[PDB]
Amino acid sequence: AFELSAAEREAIEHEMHHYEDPRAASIEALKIVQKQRGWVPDGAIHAIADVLGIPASDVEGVATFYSQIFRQPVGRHVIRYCDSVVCHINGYQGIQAALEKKLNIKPGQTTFDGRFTLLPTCCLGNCDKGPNMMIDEDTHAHLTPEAIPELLERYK
Amino acid sequence: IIRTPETHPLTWRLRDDKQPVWLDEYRSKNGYEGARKALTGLSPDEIVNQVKDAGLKGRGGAGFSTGLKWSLMPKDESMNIRYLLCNADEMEPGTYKDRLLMEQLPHLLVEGMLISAFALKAYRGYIFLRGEYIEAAVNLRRAIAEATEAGLLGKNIMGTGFDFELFVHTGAGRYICGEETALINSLEGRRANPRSKPPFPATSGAWGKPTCVNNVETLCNVPAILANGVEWYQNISKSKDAGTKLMGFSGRVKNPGLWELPFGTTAREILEDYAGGMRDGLKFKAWQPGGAGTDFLTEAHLDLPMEFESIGKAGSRLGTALAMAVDHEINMVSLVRNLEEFFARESCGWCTPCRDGLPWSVKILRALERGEGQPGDIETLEQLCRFLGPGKTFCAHAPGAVEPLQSAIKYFREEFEAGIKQPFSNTHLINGIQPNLLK
Amino acid sequence: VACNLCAVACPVGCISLQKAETKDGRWYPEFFRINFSRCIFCGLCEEACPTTAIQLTPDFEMGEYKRQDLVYEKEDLLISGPGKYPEYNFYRMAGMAIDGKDKGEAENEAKPIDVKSLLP
Amino acid sequence: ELAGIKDAAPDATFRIRGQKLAREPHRYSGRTAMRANISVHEPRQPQDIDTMFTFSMEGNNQPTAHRSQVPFAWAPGWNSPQAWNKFQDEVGGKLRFGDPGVRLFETSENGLDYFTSVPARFQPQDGKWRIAPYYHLFGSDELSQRAPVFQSRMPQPYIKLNPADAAKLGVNAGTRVSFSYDGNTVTLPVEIAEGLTAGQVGLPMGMSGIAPVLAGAHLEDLKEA
Amino acid sequence: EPAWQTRDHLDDPVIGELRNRFGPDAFTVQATRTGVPVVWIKREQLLEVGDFLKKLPKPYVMLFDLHGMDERLRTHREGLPAADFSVFYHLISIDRNRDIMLKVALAENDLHVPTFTKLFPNANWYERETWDLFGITFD
Amino acid sequence: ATIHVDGKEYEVNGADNLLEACLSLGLDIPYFCWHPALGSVGACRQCAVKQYQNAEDTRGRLVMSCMTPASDGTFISIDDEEAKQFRESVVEWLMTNHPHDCPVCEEGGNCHLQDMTVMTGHSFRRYRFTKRTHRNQDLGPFISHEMNRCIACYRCVRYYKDYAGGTDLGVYGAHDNVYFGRPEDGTLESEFSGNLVEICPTGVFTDKTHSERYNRKWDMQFAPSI
Ligand SMILES: NC(=O)C1=CN([C@@H]2O[C@H](COP(=O)(O)OP(=O)(O)OC[C@H]3O[C@@H](n4cnc5c(N)ncnc54)[C@H](O)[C@@H]3O)[C@@H](O)[C@H]2O)C=CC1
Ligand SMILES: Cc1cc2nc3c(=O)[nH]c(=O)nc-3n(C[C@H](O)[C@H](O)[C@H](O)COP(=O)(O)O)c2cc1C
Ligand code: SF4
Ligand code: SF4
Ligand code: SF4
Ligand code: SF4
Ligand code: SF4
Numbered sequence A: 001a002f003e004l005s006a007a008e009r010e011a012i013e014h015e016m017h018h019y020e021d022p023r024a025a026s027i028e029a030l031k032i033v034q035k036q037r038g039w040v041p042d043g044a045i046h047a048i049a050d051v052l053g054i055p056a057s058d059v060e061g062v063a064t065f066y067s068q069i070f071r072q073p074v075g076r077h078v079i080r081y082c083d084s085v086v087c088h089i090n091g092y093q094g095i096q097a098a099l100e101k102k103l104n105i106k107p108g109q110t111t112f113d114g115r116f117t118l119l120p121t122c123c124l125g126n127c128d129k130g131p132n133m134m135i136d137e138d139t140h141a142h143l144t145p146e147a148i149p150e151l152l153e154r155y156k
Numbered sequence B: 001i002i003r004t005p006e007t008h009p010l011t012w013r014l015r016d017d018k019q020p021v022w023l024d025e026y027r028s029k030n031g032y033e034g035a036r037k038a039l040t041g042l043s044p045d046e047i048v049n050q051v052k053d054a055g056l057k058g059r060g061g062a063g064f065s066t067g068l069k070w071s072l073m074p075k076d077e078s079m080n081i082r083y084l085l086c087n088a089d090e091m092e093p094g095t096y097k098d099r100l101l102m103e104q105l106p107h108l109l110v111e112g113m114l115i116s117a118f119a120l121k122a123y124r125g126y127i128f129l130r131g132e133y134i135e136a137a138v139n140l141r142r143a144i145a146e147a148t149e150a151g152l153l154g155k156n157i158m159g160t161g162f163d164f165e166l167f168v169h170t171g172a173g174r175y176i177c178g179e180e181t182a183l184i185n186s187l188e189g190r191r192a193n194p195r196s197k198p199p200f201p202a203t204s205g206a207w208g209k210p211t212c213v214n215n216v217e218t219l220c221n222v223p224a225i226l227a228n229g230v231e232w233y234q235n236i237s238k239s240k241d242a243g244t245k246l247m248g249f250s251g252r253v254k255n256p257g258l259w260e261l262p263f264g265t266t267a268r269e270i271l272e273d274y275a276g277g278m279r280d281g282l283k284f285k286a287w288q289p290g291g292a293g294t295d296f297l298t299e300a301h302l303d304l305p306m307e308f309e310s311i312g313k314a315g316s317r318l319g320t321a322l323a324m325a326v327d328h329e330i331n332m333v334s335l336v337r338n339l340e341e342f343f344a345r346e347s348c349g350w351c352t353p354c355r356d357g358l359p360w361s362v363k364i365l366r367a368l369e370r371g372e373g374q375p376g377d378i379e380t381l382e383q384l385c386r387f388l389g390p391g392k393t394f395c396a397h398a399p400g401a402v403e404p405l406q407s408a409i410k411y412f413r414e415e416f417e418a419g420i421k422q423p424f425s426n427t428h429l430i431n432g433i434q435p436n437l438l439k
Numbered sequence C: 001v002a003c004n005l006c007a008v009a010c011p012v013g014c015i016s017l018q019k020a021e022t023k024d025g026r027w028y029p030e031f032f033r034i035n036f037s038r039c040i041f042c043g044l045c046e047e048a049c050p051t052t053a054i055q056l057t058p059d060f061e062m063g064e065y066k067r068q069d070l071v072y073e074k075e076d077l078l079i080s081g082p083g084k085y086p087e088y089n090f091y092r093m094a095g096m097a098i099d100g101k102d103k104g105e106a107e108n109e110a111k112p113i114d115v116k117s118l119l120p
Numbered sequence D: 001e002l003a004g005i006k007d008a009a010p011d012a013t014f015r016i017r018g019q020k021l022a023r024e025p026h027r028y029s030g031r032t033a034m035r036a037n038i039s040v041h042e043p044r045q046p047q048d049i050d051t052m053f054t055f056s057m058e059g060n061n062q063p064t065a066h067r068s069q070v071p072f073a074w075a076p077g078w079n080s081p082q083a084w085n086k087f088q089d090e091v092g093g094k095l096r097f098g099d100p101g102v103r104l105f106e107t108s109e110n111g112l113d114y115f116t117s118v119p120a121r122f123q124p125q126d127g128k129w130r131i132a133p134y135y136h137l138f139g140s141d142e143l144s145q146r147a148p149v150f151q152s153r154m155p156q157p158y159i160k161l162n163p164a165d166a167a168k169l170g171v172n173a174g175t176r177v178s179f180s181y182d183g184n185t186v187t188l189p190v191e192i193a194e195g196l197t198a199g200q201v202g203l204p205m206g207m208s209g210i211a212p213v214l215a216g217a218h219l220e221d222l223k224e225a
Numbered sequence E: 001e002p003a004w005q006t007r008d009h010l011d012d013p014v015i016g017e018l019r020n021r022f023g024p025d026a027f028t029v030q031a032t033r034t035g036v037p038v039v040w041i042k043r044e045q046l047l048e049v050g051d052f053l054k055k056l057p058k059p060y061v062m063l064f065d066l067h068g069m070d071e072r073l074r075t076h077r078e079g080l081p082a083a084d085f086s087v088f089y090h091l092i093s094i095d096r097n098r099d100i101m102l103k104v105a106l107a108e109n110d111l112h113v114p115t116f117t118k119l120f121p122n123a124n125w126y127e128r129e130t131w132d133l134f135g136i137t138f139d
Numbered sequence F: 001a002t003i004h005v006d007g008k009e010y011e012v013n014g015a016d017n018l019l020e021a022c023l024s025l026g027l028d029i030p031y032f033c034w035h036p037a038l039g040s041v042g043a044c045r046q047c048a049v050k051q052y053q054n055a056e057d058t059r060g061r062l063v064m065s066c067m068t069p070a071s072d073g074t075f076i077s078i079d080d081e082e083a084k085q086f087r088e089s090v091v092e093w094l095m096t097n098h099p100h101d102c103p104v105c106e107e108g109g110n111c112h113l114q115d116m117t118v119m120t121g122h123s124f125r126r127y128r129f130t131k132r133t134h135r136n137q138d139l140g141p142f143i144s145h146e147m148n149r150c151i152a153c154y155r156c157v158r159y160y161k162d163y164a165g166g167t168d169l170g171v172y173g174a175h176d177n178v179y180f181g182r183p184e185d186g187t188l189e190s191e192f193s194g195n196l197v198e199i200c201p202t203g204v205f206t207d208k209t210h211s212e213r214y215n216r217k218w219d220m221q222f223a224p225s226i
């Protein structure tokens, strides 16, 4: 049971205006649906395939190819902590252990209430201020494991 | 650290409070004058010739000549639909130059894209920008709107007669999207699988049209060339690779950061004069010059100039010249394990050797990290490095993946040999069948 | 598993069988007949069996009056035990889902990772 | 005018270096046991007097034999359908030693004139419904619909109607409309076809009770029942 | 170097004597994994070659084998003379501890070979067996 | 055009790539992703041959014979040690995650992957870790689906989309978790979906009608018919 709203459809069409192919707005269409609904459900793939005219298999391949186009339900906030080499030298494992101790889950799982979804991510492009962590729209640098509980209370 | 316009042709206009520079402030400090000279006093062909004579190498990591790349577009006038792409992805670990280049100086990128679009007569330009750079995206949209309002983007720019439209395409977070053909594929809304070369993107690129993909730092380098001349750009350093590169050391150093230095400065100077060396109670073990896809080097390689050919002579690459320092406390087996986990979980999945051999190296390094290594794993890793070199795979992600593995095998073989504790056992004893015992 | 390897590895061609499949998905022979008047007891069917199902037991007293009665069927070859190989099961190694064996429950096989999973 | 069928395939006396062509591969199994349930005496294998093939593996199936009729593709080290690469002069092109089958006629030296009898514009007559043929891949063949695997694949028989004509009849999709053709008041559920032109009823040809000869015929007494 | 490699066998002295006796355009040498010099010899010179091998200083006093072969279906006959059928004679020199295989090529219609019974009396049953199984007539 | 394979001079068609240029002459190169009708994409990396540009060249370069044009004056080696070892390594990499399913597989004795596993002479397994698995979709009454046997050669998506024009079969997934099928379960609605049982080199897409009453390829009695 899915139906695109007015704002999502108008934004999708405006993204089709930017290119010479309606296929090229598929990634931004999926990002619009992810922004509105938290993730991309099953009917959204067919709705985007209907508005763009491309096959639904293409939309499914694009949606499942990219990591930050979520195809499964997430919590209220998605924590994306960096696990790459520079933050490993800076010790991201302490922050991962702190988040595992606080949220009492594993990387990739969601809490029973649906508050935080903990996920590793690639390099955040801020390696000089490592280690970093990207919550939904905010990046955090110079992290310490003791500041994790104080950091997680700013997202109810 | 003070930055005159001469030896810092890009980083002299930032702000001490680390705030972006807008159109009035950018234009106040000699901004959009290289674009003015390019659109008013020069043809596109002589602009391409000026960039070619400047010796501006592409700062994306390969160092290919940008003017020669611009000269490879088709000279036929029947193809007037042309595209310029700015690779603002920067998904390599250890790379942070583009973030500083667009979060604080977006109008420099806009001016360089104007100049490069006029040089190619490219009708449209796209900034393929990564999804994590949010403030950079906001600054880019604000800069595009401000330049469009004040007669710098759109229709009849300055009155020359050149129409150019600039867009920001925010990516969905895949490491392989940074590759130029995969960037073109992801720009067209498809999966980010790279394409075969030849045909190169300069002839049949985005939507089958002539399309030139350039790094952010190359487009930030071009307006200084167009404003202050070509021979001035050739008179910055006495090195074969002309220009200024944004270098810097990162990772357990005293002052990690980003500094614009001329080519030929030795890597010890960046570690000591700028990064300050190692931290309190730390020693130096290794370093890696060009992000995660580069070979490790030792202390004896620290007094080596930071050029393409000099680092390429000593069994490594210049890359993005954003070096990473690895101390003595960090175990190299676990470090290479993390590098291989990143390189195997971010593979595009098209071609066989990377897709089905990088996880094998990941599992072997997992066994070595836990001490469960078996005899024959290091030889397997060496043959894996041999068979994942250039030409074996469809693209260059896997040679860059196996460069640190072979460098750590070469220099730190005693750390890899320490992870083997259990004997080799692949089969198990089936009751009723005598096994074959090769000798 | 009715894989027909013993029938083709037989140099005489005295094994006849047809594959049938149950409701769960596992394979078995619908019938399995050996023409013992043609068999030479060369042990190539036991040698070529990938599941260790067919075995030549040490039994020789097989005298018959009519050679039509020498054609043994599936009801006469199937015994009530494992035989010479006691602790081998092919379906614990195979990657096909059967009853009591979900995907990933085989030997040296991991659990299936869905393409919609959020883990990069 | 049927003289070309002699050249379609060579006769039963055609041999590749004296031997026939094999219908089964060289590693055919169970010769002495596939008929042992009936009788332990294996009979003589059947003889094909009509054609050049034989019901046995005592035949020629090499990829380099001078023949055009290939029963199956097999090469040593090539067991897949990719074994057809050995049976061609160039891979992907024509079959080696020519493809089987010949054309019965050539192109004529001169052609026909202009067909002058143009038809009239379709005007929908009231009461009579012109039958528009809706052929399906699974169900319009006489013998393929007899296959039990096509019964789980073929669609249900729907009579296809314009939205305007269905609104005129008052019928909605899902309900049954009965139509009579030569004393057969047969009921079919209704599907709505926007692309169908008004005045026609869409019928699937080759189905149960709906012959392909119904195409173009009229259909009176089309009422909801 | 392994023993199963295709050895062309020009280092055998018998090949040198045959080249010096019958000329360099009388026979062909086949490279095989048999470990045997395989000499394709014309049908007219078969008896001359047999007498020459019988009258060597360390001669081939043994007819080890004599049998025919159907070459009508052999697709890979590179380096081999054109033949529908062939007859091979395997001879052994015990004192030399050597052996040779002489092959004569025959067409499908002209299936007659000069007999080998006079040189070696044990060729009688082998020629009878070759006639029975291959249809090759021995004059 | 004239090419040289292992010192042998061959007259070939210069408008063709090297893979079927060598396959026309009867020269065996292992290959998965290339098809004569679909084209070349350079995916499986199995068709490697060592190319030399001069007649006196020692090193050469391991190039893709399906992606290198057969121009006049290319000296390629197929049975070289480096090329053979790389092809064996590619077969081994495809065999790391392949299930132990050959007896219970509908393409046993009809498998392209079996022919290229025996062709490269790979019979020893030194991979000791776990193997990835995938779920299966119900593709209808015709196609039986077993994704565990896939090798990600991209032939199914190429044929079904760029050749057959179908819209319901696609490539999804990730690095190594690549999936080939529909976004949900249901019948493949293309009228040319049946050719996937022979386009696919492995036993992923198989004939379900044949799988009901199944016999091996050597047990089949064939005939040419219309
Ligand atoms: N975030 C970053 O900055 C990263 C940078 N890299 C760099 O990327 C490099 C690999 O780049 P690739 O594009 O895969 O390979 P490449 O070195 O062959 O190509 C790089 C550039 O050279 C041009 N080029 C080279 N030869 C050409 C020719 N004959 N004709 C036309 N254009 C030609 C290409 O068009 C492209 O713009 C690595 O060596 C590494 O240094 C790698 C990973 C991340
Ligand atoms: C796997 C891979 C990832 C890459 N990622 C980036 C990137 O994130 N940013 C970039 O500028 N170049 C990247 N490149 C290099 C590009 O191929 C190319 O050099 C770039 O688009 C333009 O470089 P140029 O400045 O020399 O013209 C990557 C290359 C590979 C093989
Ligand atoms: S090496 Fe192959 S699988 Fe890996 S990222 Fe490149 S094209 Fe994709
Ligand atoms: S032992 Fe008998 S049934 Fe088995 S392969 Fe040998 S002859 Fe055939
Ligand atoms: S007895 Fe063994 S070899 Fe024969 S069909 Fe059954 S599983 Fe296969
Ligand atoms: S597809 Fe081929 S290799 Fe895979 S299980 Fe089936 S027969 Fe074996
Ligand atoms: S399912 Fe088959 S055709 Fe498709 S990529 Fe996998 S092996 Fe190739």
Ligand code: FES
Residues within 6 Å of the ligand: A082, A083, A084, A085, A086, A087, A122, A123, A124, A125, A126, A127, A130, A131, A132, B093, B094, B095
């Ligand atoms: S390595 Fe973590 S921000 Fe770059």
Ligand code: FES
Residues within 6 Å of the ligand: F030, F031, F032, F033, F034, F041, F042, F043, F044, F045, F046, F047, F064, F065, F066, F067
């Ligand atoms: S056949 Fe050439 S890479 Fe697949």
Ligand SMILES: [Ca+2]
Residues within 6 Å of the ligand: D048, D049, D050, D051
């Ligand atoms: Ca008949």
